[PDB]
Symmetry: C3
Subunit: 485 residues, 3 copies
Amino acid sequence: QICIGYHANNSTEKVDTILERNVTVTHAKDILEKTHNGKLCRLSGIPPLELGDCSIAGWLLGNPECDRLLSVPEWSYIVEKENPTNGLCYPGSFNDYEELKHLLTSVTHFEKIKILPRDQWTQHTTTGGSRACAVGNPSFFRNMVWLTKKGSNYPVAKRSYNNTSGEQMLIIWGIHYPNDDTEQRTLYQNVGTYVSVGTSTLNKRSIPEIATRPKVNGQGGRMEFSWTLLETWDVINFESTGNLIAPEYGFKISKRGSSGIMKTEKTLENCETKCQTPLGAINTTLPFHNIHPLTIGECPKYVKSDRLVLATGLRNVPGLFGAIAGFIEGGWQGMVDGWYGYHHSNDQGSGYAADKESTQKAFDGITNKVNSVIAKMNTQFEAVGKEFSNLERRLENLNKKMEDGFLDVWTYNAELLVLMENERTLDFHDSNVKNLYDKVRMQLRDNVKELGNGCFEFYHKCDDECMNSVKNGTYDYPKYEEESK
Amino acid sequence: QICIGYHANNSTEKVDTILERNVTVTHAKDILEKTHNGKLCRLSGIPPLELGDCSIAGWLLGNPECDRLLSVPEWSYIVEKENPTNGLCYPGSFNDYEELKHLLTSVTHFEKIKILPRDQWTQHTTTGGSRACAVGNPSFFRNMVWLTKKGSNYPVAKRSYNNTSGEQMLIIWGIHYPNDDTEQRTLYQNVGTYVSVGTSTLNKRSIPEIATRPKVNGQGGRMEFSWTLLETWDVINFESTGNLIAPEYGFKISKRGSSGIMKTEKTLENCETKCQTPLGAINTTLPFHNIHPLTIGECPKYVKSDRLVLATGLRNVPGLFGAIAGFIEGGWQGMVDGWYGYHHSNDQGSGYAADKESTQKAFDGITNKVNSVIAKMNTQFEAVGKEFSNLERRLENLNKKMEDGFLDVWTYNAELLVLMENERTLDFHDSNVKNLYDKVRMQLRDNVKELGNGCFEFYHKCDDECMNSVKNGTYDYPKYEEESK
Amino acid sequence: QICIGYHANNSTEKVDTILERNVTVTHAKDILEKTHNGKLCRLSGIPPLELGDCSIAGWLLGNPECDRLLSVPEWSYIVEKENPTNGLCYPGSFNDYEELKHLLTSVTHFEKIKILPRDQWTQHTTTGGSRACAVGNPSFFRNMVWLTKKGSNYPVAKRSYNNTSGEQMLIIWGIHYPNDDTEQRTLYQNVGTYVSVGTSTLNKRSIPEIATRPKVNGQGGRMEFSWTLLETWDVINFESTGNLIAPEYGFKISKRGSSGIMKTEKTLENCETKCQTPLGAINTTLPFHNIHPLTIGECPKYVKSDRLVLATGLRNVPGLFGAIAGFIEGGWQGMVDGWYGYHHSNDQGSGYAADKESTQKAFDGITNKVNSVIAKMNTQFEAVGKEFSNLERRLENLNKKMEDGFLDVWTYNAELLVLMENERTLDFHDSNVKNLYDKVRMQLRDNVKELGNGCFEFYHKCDDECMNSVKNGTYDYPKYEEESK
């Protein structure tokens, strides 16, 4: 007796296919990454700029509450709170704020130079402060200078600066909007003041917009700050008859490319990632994850799925070709050195023997299928998270419409890819067993009867050495011409 | 004698496959929804704000032509004509208009409130009107007040409002731009006038731009409107020496999400949908539709295709496994209670009996195939259509480039899905038939003769309970040892 | 004897399937276009507007270095260098420049009309020039008029123009920002000047800002230009007390759709395409290419792949159904008129004969498969390249994140489509052979013996007439009852 069978085990591993659901399989592979390390790490050897609970505005201006900030010269992404607590301690806005944040998202190299020393403002008062930026005496943004009148005079304030630092330089200035005409006169003496700033390409003139406002942080006044990148060997001109908040420092900056701000509560924790999420770092080979949409780095695609499992083994039986769970009704728990093999009732022993060469062709194939699915996915560095003012609601909605559009597409493709390929994997094994059976039938023919359960009854004495002529595809028909039929 | 066969009927359904075109099939399912109810319906219980032929601006300002408007307090989307006939009856612009429309696109909750009563502008005149907003007497936007001179004086107009309504409040104001220096004085006496508006975050000061302009609605002047959201318990301050168009009303407003403006002339009708289009509402389980690109709601994916028919039954004849339309050269008109079955020529009679074991595995399977294709589609709520000013041409083009890009992707994938899955459905049936035939052959053997056209000729007698033993898989070889050969 | 077999040849064409790599195939089709003509062509009959090394700004204003420019009236895209040498010869900015470039991207119809002739500026000096626009006396943009004082006076400059031209007209004006108070007097005499421009919808008043600036092209002053579309039968009104840079010309423009600007150094070169890239033109039926991402026209999808070969022939051997390179161990070099066929050994001769019928079914099926993959692709017209100022980094990053999104999607889908469909083409051929073999075995039966690699040994005499019957499917069992067994 010779029998063609297939492998079985104690697996409870389930998969879905196009045609059937919850189908138990021999071996399987999850291709969806769902675990992180819950840490917040450094991105490819380069740390994040950690802001604690300051805002970029607050950090750059020199809010006294950002003094203990600790600044690296490099950083690869920024960490901020979804709602920071130390920003403009003096009320105001920041022109093109989001553009500025996006510009500082990632940096070479970035250092703070002193470009316009306080004391050189010789005809003006410099110590101007406010209870709003208080340390319990009134202080002010440490990087800026509030030029006010000296005595009863405010002469034209006018300085320039040639960018000799060798690198593109970020420079910030501001204009102060008083609460009323009287407060204007006591700070600046003059009424029709203006702030004028100009470079080669920049060319801007502001005038104070005096108006009655509710108090924010106990102040009815406001400051509107602006910023420019001063190109190398170019000069920036300030001229003002009042209301200027002058920079004292500039920031040398260089960039390789762009990145993201990560909105989170966590804190850098000393490690390494190629891919960071607000919940933790991801180290994975798999092509999909479902951890968090807002990642930074080279990440697996984010999918709205919570199971993506490829069958690799075979239908676990305690098809399209009619073999597995077909004319060969069940699998063999015994044979464990292959996926398909032989079982023989003889006069010596009996008798499980794996078909190495056919199990090998299949380990190769299925290994290739898995690797096709995984290795064909392209993962370049991206930043996902994005920033919009509350007058860019449409733009923000456009961005969400896009992220969501790709999310729907990848999920659908993934789900269906897994389902379709699982149906073909099973048929694959089913075909392999069926061709095994046939690779024996077309060879025995008359020296055996077709029993049914994938068995052949021998018309002669087939000792262990004859049973090996069948297993290795080299059985001779001529030799056994004994007709017991 | 027992024949193996498969179902055929009078159907004329055609599907396409990867390898074949116009292939007549037994049963099919169109997975492309292309019918609407020609009605404009309310969305998950909540109706649309119907603007008739007014613009949002005309509505909010109180254009007199928008009096019999009817205003719901809720609304889930807005209906507006492509080009409304009642907007600014007095010529002018509206700062950040598109952002405002996007804000009002859906709403909790929306209530107009008198916040600055006219008659309390005690030192100014209120009955300012124009022929441009005629009723046939000069009139004006009903929600605004045109402050002008009282005698030969226009003092500092200065009022404020604390938002005690417990909701976030929309507030609009405008400044006037006269056609020439003389028109100005007859209206405001003063010449260096300004308009000042402040809140906690708002801070604005506008000055009039006197200049000769072509007459729109017989008017050379222009009115430039602005708007802000005043937060709860915050106060807004107005101050002006002339040219201020003050609001009388504010609008309490709350929001959960965003929605969209649907261009169309149809009117609300009193039905319901999860999904609306400018042509009619859609009610469907199907994953795709081709009615119209600009839907609002939880919709199927829009595709360029105009036919996605999924084969569910089998090839219909008067394959890959070479049974169907192959070695069994035809289907059976007769048999109608299964897809595959038997036909016995016996001394009692004949002979059609469907096969319930395999026909059920197929219903099961093809059912799951359809459900997988449908139930994997992710359908959240979206609004598609958007709005852009004539200086956001690039941004609009970005949006189109985006909507067009997904359209191409979903079309291609749906078209190919159907083509591939159809080829594999037919091969599924072809296989089920081939396996039936094989399950019978492997049960008889010696006891019967393989004819060629799918039949077995018995080498012995076989009454009815002889067939009912083969069909159910319970046939015992040993009992029949007559070898008429 | 009669044997079934398949085609083989001397191909070294290789394809990848889901299960195998580097598989040598009988015939194949590359579906990735990889070649361009290196020419810069015209798009569907319509040329590009070529700018040499001017910028659109310099071209419209009429920079004297653009005299040789060659202006056509139609054009389907614009060719510009990455960084053009002749732009604003006199330093300045250009309000909403990117929107203007986008406007002019494609054009009907485009024609320069003389709308405000120089000489009619009778109260002012017109020949105002600058050394910055030297010809080697001072000159100026040829399409603009630099109004300066005549004698010691500069009367209110006031002119209007009503667009009677039958098309929408683009108009450009400018305001001069001088370097210092004396430059202003020597040019304009007056002190608190203004520039007023108005139409139906446009309404701008501009006062000049005198300030000290770095010198660019030797100028401290700056000129800011603005533009508008003057609709038909509308009028534009200029009024100015100095500092106006007036138009002399407007541009009748008409637009069907939109296009793009192509950045490259190449020149128009007198040929044709439906699809243009900065490297050269593409003439192709294929659905995919990898030449360059920035195309213009009706183009194949761009993918990161650099090999998309579709198998069309069978495994080459000099599978899933166990025929090809399976139970029939190899192919026939010498069957050159079909994919599958017969080899008869006869008393007469022997004996390769291609099977016309089934080879055709295959040529048909694979033709369809290739046409389905190619023809389902949606090649609408798009421009791709896009322009953003340096304060639109976010917006530009938004666009990049989108182009990449689609690139990643199309690439993955194409790669896997090929792999999956290759796996099934091979298995298709395999199936055809297996079935042709069975179509003989079921037709002979007793009358022949199953030998080995697809061979049947006849139990009777078979002449070249009997042979033909087996081949054409007519052979009869009854006739030949010679039972040499």
